[PDB]
Design a protein around this ligand. Sequence first.
Ligand SMILES: *CCC(=O)N(CCC(N)=O)NC(=O)[C@H](CC1CCCCC1)NC(=O)[C@@H](NC(=O)OCc1ccccc1)[C@@H](C)OC(C)(C)C
Ligand SMILES: *CCC(=O)N(CCC(N)=O)NC(=O)[C@H](CC1CCCCC1)NC(=O)[C@@H](NC(=O)OCc1ccccc1)[C@@H](C)OC(C)(C)C
Lengths: 302, 302
Amino acid sequence: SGFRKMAFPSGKVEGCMVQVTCGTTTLNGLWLDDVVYCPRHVICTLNPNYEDLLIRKSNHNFLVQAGNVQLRVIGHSMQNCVLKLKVDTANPKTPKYKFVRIQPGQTFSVLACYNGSPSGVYQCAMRPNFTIKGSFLNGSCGSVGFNIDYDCVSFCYMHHMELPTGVHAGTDLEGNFYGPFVDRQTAQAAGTDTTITVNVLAWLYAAVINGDRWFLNRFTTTLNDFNLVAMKYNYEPLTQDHVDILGPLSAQTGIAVLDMCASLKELLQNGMNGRTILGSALLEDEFTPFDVVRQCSGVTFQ
Amino acid sequence: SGFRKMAFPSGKVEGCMVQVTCGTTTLNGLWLDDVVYCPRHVICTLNPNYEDLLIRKSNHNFLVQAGNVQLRVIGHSMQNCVLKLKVDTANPKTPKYKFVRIQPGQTFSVLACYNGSPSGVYQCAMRPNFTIKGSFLNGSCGSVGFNIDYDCVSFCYMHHMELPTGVHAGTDLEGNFYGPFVDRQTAQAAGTDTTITVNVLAWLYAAVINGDRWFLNRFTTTLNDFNLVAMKYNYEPLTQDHVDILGPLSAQTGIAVLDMCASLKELLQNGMNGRTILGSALLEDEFTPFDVVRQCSGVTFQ
Ligand SMILES: *CCC(=O)N(CCC(N)=O)NC(=O)[C@H](CC1CCCCC1)NC(=O)[C@@H](NC(=O)OCc1ccccc1)[C@@H](C)OC(C)(C)C
Ligand SMILES: *CCC(=O)N(CCC(N)=O)NC(=O)[C@H](CC1CCCCC1)NC(=O)[C@@H](NC(=O)OCc1ccccc1)[C@@H](C)OC(C)(C)C
C-alpha cells in the first residue's frame, strides 16, 4: 500500500543526455543513434528568422560533449523548433524508443538536466492549457519528458521556456510546440487552465484501493448532471470515453463510475472539511487511470 | 521556477538490481562488486532463528538472476538482518558508493523493484517514528533507498515490511532496522509520529524563493516561545542546530529564521484559510534544507 508521485526509472534516458554548445549558448541535447536533438534556439543571434540564422552556421560551430568525449557534427537540419545534429558516432546506450505527441491530461516523467548532466526526476502532467507545472532553472532547456512501456522509451516532451506565471512550455521531439507558444521572447501567456476530471476520479479510486472510503456516498448522478456541476468548478467535461477508461478501476473496486462522480460532486460542493485523501488536502489531478493501475498493481520494466 | 517532489536520477542503482530466489521465496537484491545484498528472510522456513536456518543452507540453494544471466553463489554470510551472497562475478556497472545510516528527517529516493526489475522512483523521508510512507506491494522487499552526492551513491535504506497502518519499515544496508522493528510476523506498530519542523521551514523558504510571500508577517518569536506552540501541534522541537542549518536559506531570502518561525506559528494557529503554498493545502515536511537549495539552485551529478 501507499500512493506516491512515482516517476519512471530514468537510467535509459540518462545514457542519452549530452551538452550542446554553439557560440555563447549551452543547453542539453538528446543523443539517439547518430543524431543529437536539441532546441533550435541554440543557434547564433527578439524575433529571429531561424532558417536565415541556420544557413550561416557551419558544422564545426557546434560543440557536442557526451561525458568526457567530444562528438563530431557532420550534418544538421531543422525540423520545426528542434535541431537535429548528425554526429559521426552512434550512441551505444541508445534504448529502444519512439517519439510520441501526447494529449492534455496525459502524464510523463521529466529528467531535469543542466550542461548535459541529470539533476533530478519528477512526474508531470500536460495541462489542459498545454503548459506543464515543471521545476526548471536557466540551462534546463533540452531536458526531456518520457514514458516507459515495458522496454521502450516514448519521448513526449522537450523543454524550451518558462512563462511569466512560473509554468513551462515546450515541444514534442519533432519540434512542434504544445499549445500556441512560439520560441521567441515576445509576450506570451498560458491561458486559463482547468482541472483534469478523469484523473481526479482515478485518484479517488486509488484512495479506495488503499483503504480510504470516507468520501463515498449513497447517491448517483447522470453524466449530464455531473458535467453541470463540473463546469461551475472549472473542471473539464467528463466524456463517455473517460467513463470507459475508468472501467477497470470501477470493476476492481465495485464502485460504479457515475457513483464515484456523485462522490466527486459532493466533494466539490462541500469541500473536504479539514480531512485528507492519500495525504493531500486538495483534489489531485496528475494521476491518469493508467498511472493508478500501474502503481496499485506493480508493473515493472525490463 | 516551480517546485516538485524531485528524486535523484536512478540509473546508477538500476544497474545494481537483481533477483534472489531461494526455495519458494523471491525478492530483490543489490549487486555491488562481487556481493549481493538482500533481506535475510529470503531463507527457508512466526519467530524464526535465522542463524539456525542459515547453517542448513547450501550455496547452490540461492538462485541469483541479473538480467538474463545467472550468477553463481560461492559464499554467504549474515550481517544483522541482511544476507550477503558472494558471487563469482563483480558487477561491471558498480557505481562509486557508500553505505550510510541516516537520521530521522533526512530524505532519500526509493527505486521500487519487483523480481529484480525497477518499477518507479519516488522521494521519501525517514519519519520521526522511523517508518517511511512508501508505495510498496508484495515482492518489493530488497528495493533500496539512496542519495547521490556528485558521483557517489549513498545507500541508506533497504525495504523489509509493511505495518498495519500502511507505512513501511526496513534497514540500513548493514541490516540494522530503523526504529524498534524486528523481521518477524509478530504484532508491531509504528508509534506516534510528529511533523519535521525544520523541513516545513525549509519548504516555506522555497515558497519565498519562488515568489510566494502571502504567509509572512511582521512579527518575530523566541526559539522557546516557538517550541511551546510547536509542541501543541505535534511538531518536533526546533533546535539551535536546525536554526544554523537554515542559515544559507535565511541569508538568500533576507528572512530571519525566527521571523520565519513567527510565520509558521501563525499558520499553525490560523490554518491556511483555503489558500495554497507551492501547490499544497498542507504544510509539507518532506523537503530538507539541502533539498531546497539543490532544487532552487540546480546542482547536478556526474
Ligand atoms: C534554453 C534556456 C533555458 O534553460 N530555458 C528554460 C528557462 C526555464 N527556467 O525554464 N529557456 C529560456 O530561458 C528561454 C530562452 C529563449 C531563447 C530565445 C527563443 C525562446 C526561448 N527564455 C525564457 O524561458 C523566457 N520566457 C519568455 O521569453 O517568454 C515569453 C515572454 C517574454 C516577455 C514577456 C512575457 C513572456 C524567460 C527566461 O523569461 C521569463 C518569462 C521572464 C522568465
Ligand atoms: C519481502 C516481501 C515483501 O515484499 N514485503 C513488503 C510488503 C510491502 N507491501 O511492503 N515484505 C513482507 O511482505 C513481509 C515479509 C515477512 C517475512 C518474515 C520476516 C518478516 C517479513 N511481511 C510483511 O510486510 C507483513 N507485516 C508484518 O508482519 O508486520 C508485523 C505484524 C504482524 C501481524 C500483525 C501486525 C503486525 C505484512 C505483509 O502484513 C500486513 C501488516 C498484514 C500487511
